[PDB]
Structures are given as C-alpha cells and as structure tokens.
Symmetry: none
Subunit: 260 residues, 2 copies
Amino acid sequence: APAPNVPGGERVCAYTSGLSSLSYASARVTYPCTLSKAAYPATTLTGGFSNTKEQMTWLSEHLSSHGYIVITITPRNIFGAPTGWESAHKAGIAKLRSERSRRASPLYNKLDPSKFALTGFSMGGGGALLAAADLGSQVKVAVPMAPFLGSNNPNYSAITAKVLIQAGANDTVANPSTVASYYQSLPTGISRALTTFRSASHLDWINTGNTNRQARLKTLVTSWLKVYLDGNSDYATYLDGAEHSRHLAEDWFTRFEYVR
Amino acid sequence: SAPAPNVPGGERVCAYTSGLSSLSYASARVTYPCTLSKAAYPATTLTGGFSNTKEQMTWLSEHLSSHGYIVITITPRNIFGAPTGWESAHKAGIAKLRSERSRRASPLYNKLDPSKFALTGFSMGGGGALLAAADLGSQVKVAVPMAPFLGSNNPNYSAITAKVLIQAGANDTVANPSTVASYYQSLPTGISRALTTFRSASHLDWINTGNTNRQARLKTLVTSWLKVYLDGNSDYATYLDGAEHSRHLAEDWFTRFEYVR
C-alpha cells in the first residue's frame, strides 16, 4: 500500500492526440505507462474559473502514479459559469468511453467504466456536483475540491456517487461555510465526507499552492479513490483508522465528517 | 395499445458486423429484431457526432431495434472531421443497406423495405443527416437530426422530401436551441416536420452517458416519429398530437414544440 501523500509505484505517461471534443477546449490524459492490468479506474479533473488543465498537474500526475487514468480538461470557456464545467465533466466521461472503443487510442480496451470518478476544483467542483447529479449511477465517485456553485443548484436528490467534498479553512472564495452547506445537501444514503483543511486557501488546489498542504490534500483524495473506486481497504486507515488519528494529532482539519 | 415508445419494445435484439465494411466509413454495427418474421423491415442509419464512435449510440440503436427497426450505427471515417463527413457516413449506410438486402449470406437478405429508409444522427451527425437528406431526396422517407450542428454548412433545404423531426436541448450550449430552431425554420413547407426542444436537456443527453430519465423522453419522440412517418403506423400518433402528447405538455417536457402533420 504505497503512501497516498507521495507518488506511487507507477511511472506516468501522457498523451493529448485524439482528445478533441466540441464540449471543451483541450484535454490531457495521464496514465501508468505499462498498462499491464486488465482494466483501470479513471477520473476527470478540472480547475475552475480562469484555470486551465496545465495548472492541475500536481494532482493528475500524482493520481496516475497511484494507478489512475486521469483526463484533465480545460473547459470551452474558462471564464464561464459552473454549468460550463458540468459539460466538461460529462465530456470527459464521454471521451474516456470513446477512447476505450477507439482502436488507435492508448486506452483501447483498458478502462473500467464502472470505476469512473469526477474530480474538480472551485467552479470545476461545482461542475462535478452538477454532473454527479445528472449522471447518477454512471459515475461511482465525485470529489469536489473547494467547490463553487454560485447560483446553480444541483439535483442533490439524484446523486448516487460516493462523494468527498474538500474545503479550505482560510478560503475566502469558496467559503468553508458555503462548501459545508453543499455537503449537508447530499443524500443521507451515500458514503460521503467533508474535509476542511486548516490553513488551506483557495489556490492550494492548483500548482501554485503549498507543497506540504497539498500532501494532505493528496492523502485524502487518493485514499477516497482507493477505498470507493477500487474497493481497496488498505487505505481506510487514512479515512477513519490509525492514520486519520495521526491527522487529528497534527490538527489537519478545522472540520471533519465521514459517513462510511 | 401499441408498445410504449419510452421503454424497450417487444423484440429481442440481435447484432452483427461481418460484411459491413465500407470505404466511406470506419466501422458499422447492425442491430435488428432476432426473428425477422415480417416480409420487410424499416431501417435507419444512426451516427454520433464529432469525436463519437458507434459504441456510444447503443442507448438508441438497441431501443429502436427492440421496437422493430433495423439500425445501422456507424463510426465515420474521420471522427474529428466536419459535418460533410457524417453526410458521407449516412449515404454509405443507405448504400450498405441496399447491398445487405441483396447479399444471400446477410441476415437482412430480402428483408428490407427500400421505401422505408431513414437517417438519424446526433450533433455533427445531425448536420450530416440534414445534408444527406437534401442530396438523397426521395431515397429516404424520414430524417431525425438530433441536436444538429451544421457550422457554416448551408444545406439545400429545398431538395429535402423526407419527413423531418428536429430535436434540441434547452440547455444545449454546443447545438444552441436557437440555431437548431433556425434549421427547422429552413425546412421546406411541403413536408411533414416537427421541432421538439426538451426542457432541461443538455448536448450530451444524446450519447450513452446522457441522463436516463431525459433519454426516455428523447426515445419517446424519436420512436413515435419513425412509427408514424416511416412505418405508417397511426397507433403512435397519440405521442405526437394526441392524448400522450397532452401528457407531455402537462409534464412540461418542451420549451419548444412545433409540428406540421
């Protein structure tokens, strides 16, 4: 069980050829280079307003180093509204399924469509909530990170994914109170968590964020994917086991909630 | 009375790919009712759009074949092309159906009615369906462009003789509903035609990962249009301008509804 706060075993490859879509501006897939296993779980990844996919590599290349396919996406309008990122997320899921069927693609017959996630920062996290509500059981996990929904309201009643919502205690864009209200909108019957990190500011979720703090962010995101995408209970310790106790002893969180 | 068009029909669905190669598209898959007891079946092409493959359209192809349709779902030669590339795919589908009808070893041998051919396509495949329907004229009876995207392609609408249902999504930002409505406004005045813009529908509702509840509404209209105007089965008219259509109004399915019978 590679530690989730640092790169995992796998060497990471990437490509952009064949990833065009009318529903976003550009995309980049990172993946474990060998691709030796029978099928791989996958997640979308976006930033938010004014961000592009290049700003999210701190997370995409970390996750692919732990065995995940990641499609990181620049939406059609980086200066748009959260529904613009909703479309980007659905287009990422569509592209992954398309790539599984495209003989020329490096992902040909290598994706497990039952282990797809949506992951997104700020307005991209709002888009991830909107898309999780629209896709229903077609996505297994959603990870909205410092989500920003503005006026938009997802159909929370329809979400079936296992949802980890992250917030930043010092975040004045996605106020941790507002993020918490999204988390308290979720269905009571889904596995879910709220992790509000001490000292974290909004931009801790792009490349220019604090390296030490991002290790904390990576710990939770990676472990959530391992437990609820792969079903790997070796990473439960980081959610409510001995490692979570270490996080408490280090005062990682201003607020923490978890429904297994 | 007739099987409901929002859920699978009465027929078990079979499929084949052998013999479907063409130099005008990359790949194709025919779905069909397994028994083929009727003397002649109606048929439609089906494509996705830019960056789509035929695998992503099975929500509709397998539904339609469960309602008695032969469907040839097609991955174009260039999935990253322009709408005229899907126009080619649609014409290639019609030519392949003609060929299959005469091919002794084909499941469809002598089982197609060439007076009941249709084109159905999503986004740039919907633009391709409009472009192909103009060039094909009376060779196709029905066309169903779904959230069509034509770009700066300008079809010769005055050559379309098919009965055309255009679908749109009220929340569609790629195939903007006002632009799609402009295509409807361009259709010739002598054809049966309709515009259905679906409340709350987004562009990617017309591929497999679309919202399943909204897709049931999409299936209702696509299936009912083919039944009435391809099959000539008046038992589905209720879904267009009868009691079932009035249920759709009651449930606020549409931001736009236009229909010339």
